């Protein structure tokens, strides 16, 4: 949760 970007 709270991923570092859209790739996640």
């Amino acid at each position: 949760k709270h991923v570092p970007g859209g790739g996640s």
Epitope: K1, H2, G5, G6, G7
Partner: antibody, heavy 120, light 113 residues
């Protein structure tokens, strides 16, 4: 309408800390990320990092680890960026921006920027 | 960390002409599950904050007229401005949001007259 209200220009002395606010309105504060961007006069945009006020979690551009500290206060809908032990390298405009976390991951609304001058 | 390369560094065009500019990423910005490129374009006029123009490589932001068009996919992206107006002079930045965030160095648009 979405709005991010940042504070006016600051003159701060070398070696001190400066903390600047970014007061969000017009949307659910805990549904979006706040990111921070540095711009030296006449130069390009550089990403500092981001905070998700829902969880308090952060990500940073490696360059700014231990220079920038991002926080947020849910009750006031305000995000803060603190710069520690400033030097003339830190003289720049700092923008906050709303990041549409989870869909576009794009900074759709931007504050007016806080101009920091670091000088004795 | 993803490196973003914009070219040309600046461009001069006459009012009414079409301009094209390039943005390349060191890694694919396309995620197969979501099927989106995490690539955005921002316009910054003198003395103003940056403004979002295009996200997901090709989706125009609220209120932005269709003469601004983003295209491309993966590592290769383009911004086209048709019927350039004098009021379009700005620096145009691309920015990846696949993993952390990185701005390209900008393409400066000048007007010929």
């Amino acid at each position: 309408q979405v709005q991010l209200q940042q504070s006016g220009p600051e003159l701060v002395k070398p070696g001190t800390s400066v903390k600047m606010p970014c007061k969000a309105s017009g949307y659910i504060f805990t549904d979006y990320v706040i990111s921070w961007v540095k711009q030296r006069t006449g130069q390009g945009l550089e990403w500092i990092g981001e905070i998700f006020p829902r969880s308090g979690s952060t990500y940073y551009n490696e360059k700014f680890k231990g220079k920038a500290t991002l926080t947020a206060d849910k009750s006031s809908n305000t995000a803060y960026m603190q710069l520690s032990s400033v030097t003339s390298e830190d003289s720049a405009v700092y923008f906050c921006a709303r990041d549409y976390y989870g869909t576009s991951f794009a900074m759709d609304y931007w504050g007016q920027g806080t101009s920091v001058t670091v000088s004795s | 960390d993803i490196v973003m390369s914009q070219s040309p560094s600046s461009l001069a065009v006459s009012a009414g002409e079409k301009v094209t500019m390039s943005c390349k990423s060191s890694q694919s910005l396309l995620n197969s599950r979501t099927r989106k490129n995490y690539l955005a374009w921002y316009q910054q006029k003198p003395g103003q904050s940056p403004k979002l123009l295009i996200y997901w490589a090709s989706t125009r932001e609220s209120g932005v007229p269709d003469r601004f068009t983003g295209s491309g996919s993966g590592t290769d992206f383009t911004l086209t401005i048709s019927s350039v107006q004098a009021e379009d002079l700005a620096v145009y930045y691309c920015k990846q949001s696949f993993y952390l965030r990185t701005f390209g160095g900008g393409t400066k648009l000048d007007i010929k007259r």
